[PDB]
Design a protein around this ligand. Sequence first.
Ligand SMILES: O=C(O)CNC(=O)C(=O)O
Ligand SMILES: [Mg+2]
Ligand code: NI
Ligand SMILES: [Zn+2]
Length: 331
Amino acid sequence: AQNPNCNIMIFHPTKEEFNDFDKYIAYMESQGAHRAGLAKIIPPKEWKARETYDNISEILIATPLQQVASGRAGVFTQYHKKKKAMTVGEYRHLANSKKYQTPPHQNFEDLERKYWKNRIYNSPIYGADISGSLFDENTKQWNLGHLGTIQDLLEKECGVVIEGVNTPYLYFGMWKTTFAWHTEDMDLYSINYLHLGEPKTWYVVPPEHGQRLERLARELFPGSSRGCGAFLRHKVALISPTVLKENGIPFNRITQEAGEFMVTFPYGYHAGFNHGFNCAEAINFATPRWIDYGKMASQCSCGEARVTFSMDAFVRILQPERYDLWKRGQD
Ligand SMILES: O=C(O)CNC(=O)C(=O)O
Ligand SMILES: [Mg+2]
Ligand code: NI
Ligand SMILES: [Zn+2]
């Protein structure tokens, strides 16, 4: 069995290997990349996402989210407080202000220490989940707005035609902005490209060990767990690497830099934080290997998780027994 210790693998495809996205995902899995839950893909030196980032300041962040924490430094939840709209230019200025800018630090490890020590005492503002793309239409390779859709994959594998569309999302980040522990909707893959700016640190649990994370989370967030049997779908809970080590949960960590792709694999729990002002783009996708994960994915039916239009058909076709309860949670 390839990659039996579930280490995060890093790939350096040639320009030729960068042509066929599906084939390269399948190649990565042949080498055991999916066992980690997360892989890094460094694009060939010939490739570019677009010509420059000089003209992005007028993009609107309609609902910036202030991420307010509660709990202790290693074990906390966050809620999202809606702020007034601002442009990417206004946001970048705010990120770089004394109140929100990255502190002086020696290296990524020092910054990680500072994040886990001090995150709870600040409430950074995140521009998340903005529908859109920064890939040039003329970028033909690994263009996140031109991937095959999850609806077409399900149709190709299973023969059922379904409604729904699948488009990318932009994330504008600042120091301490945080993504809580989660797997993707319906345990899909995700792909994330860091277009510009400061890094993003990721933590990941191997898919084969996801249930160990869930058990710990139920222990650490006992009221949340009573409220919903899939409360990690709410995307609000954080657990530090120190706490995971203390409880024997297998995980790995890696820092993504501008110009790099990360791929999360089905049922790979991940979490992380941004180092400073940045812009990422991400989208879900599927492969044939996903179908079995989709069929077994947990669902939140308590009402909190509320998700896209397009998840309806996935639940309806893959999880017909669950569909009625899940939809009640939607309404
Ligand atoms: O970049 C972020 O804030 C969150 N991204 C993801 O969880 C992802 O790409 O799967
Ligand atoms: Mg603009
Ligand atoms: Ni994700
Ligand atoms: Zn729930």
